[PDB]
From a paper:
The initial step involved in oxidative hydroxylation of monoaromatic and polyaromatic compounds by the microorganism Sphingobium yanoikuyae strain B1 (B1), previously known as Sphingomonas yanoikuyae strain B1 and Beijerinckia sp. strain B1, is performed by a set of multiple terminal Rieske non-heme iron oxygenases. These enzymes share a single electron donor system consisting of a reductase and a ferredoxin (BPDO-FB1). One of the terminal Rieske oxygenases, biphenyl 2,3-dioxygenase (BPDO-OB1), is responsible for B1's ability to dihydroxylate large aromatic compounds, such as chrysene and benzo[a]pyrene. Rieske oxygenase systems have multiple components whose function is to transfer electrons from NAD(P)H to active molecular oxygen and ultimately oxidize aromatic hydrocarbon substrates.
The asymmetric unit contains two copies of the BPDO-FB1 molecule. The final model contains residues 3 – 104 in chains A and B. The structure has been refined to a resolution of 1.9 Å with a final Rfactor of 19.3% and an Rfree of 24.0%. The structure of the biphenyl dioxygenase system's ferredoxin component, BPDO-FB1, is the fourth Rieske oxygenase ferredoxin structure to be determined and shares significant sequence and structural homology with these proteins. BPDO-FB1 has structural features similar to other ferredoxins including three stacked beta sheets and a solvent exposed Rieske cluster. In addition to the conserved CXH-CXXH motif present in all Rieske ferredoxins, there are two additional conserved residues, Phe-71 and Pro-82, in the dioxygenase ferredoxins. The conserved proline is located at a hairpin turn at the apex of the ferredoxin and has previously been classified as part of a polyproline loop in Rieske ferredoxins. Unlike the biphenyl ferredoxin from LB400, which has three consecutive prolines, this ferredoxin has only a single proline in the loop. BPDO-FB1 is the ideal protein for exploring these effects; unlike the other Rieske oxygenase ferredoxins, this protein contains a residue which hydrogen bonds to the cluster through the side-chain, as opposed to through the main-chain as present in other ferredoxins. Thus substitution of Cys-83 with alanine, valine, or serine, can probe the effect of local charge and hydrogen bonding on the reduction potential. While the Rieske ferredoxin structure is very similar to other Rieske ferredoxins, the differences in amino acid composition near the cluster in BPDO-FB1 provide a unique opportunity among the Rieske oxygenase ferredoxins to examine the effect of cluster environment and hydrogen bonding on reduction potential.
Numbering used by the authors: 3 to 104
Amino acid sequence: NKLRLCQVASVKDGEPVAVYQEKMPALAVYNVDGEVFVTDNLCTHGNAMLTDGYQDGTIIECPFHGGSFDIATGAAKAFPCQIPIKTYPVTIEDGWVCIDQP
Ligand code: FES
């Protein structure tokens, strides 16, 4: 069923949270205008973590190359990002950010 990632309270808009859950690839947790989204953290273009880049609303920019993704959709937006980031459907369970065990 569900995997707890981090407390909802820990995720501020503009400051994504790296979560390393033992079943999963590195994960990134975001708050966009008060709502939570979860993506893979490893950039699809290289060896950088998206939680070390720059959130601008629904856009997360990679710390390298100027690449970017849409947090909410997974879309690769700014070049050189081309392969969409994996996203996960999010549930809040008792104050925790959760995703399904996949
Ligand atoms: S490693 Fe993220 S855009 Fe190149």
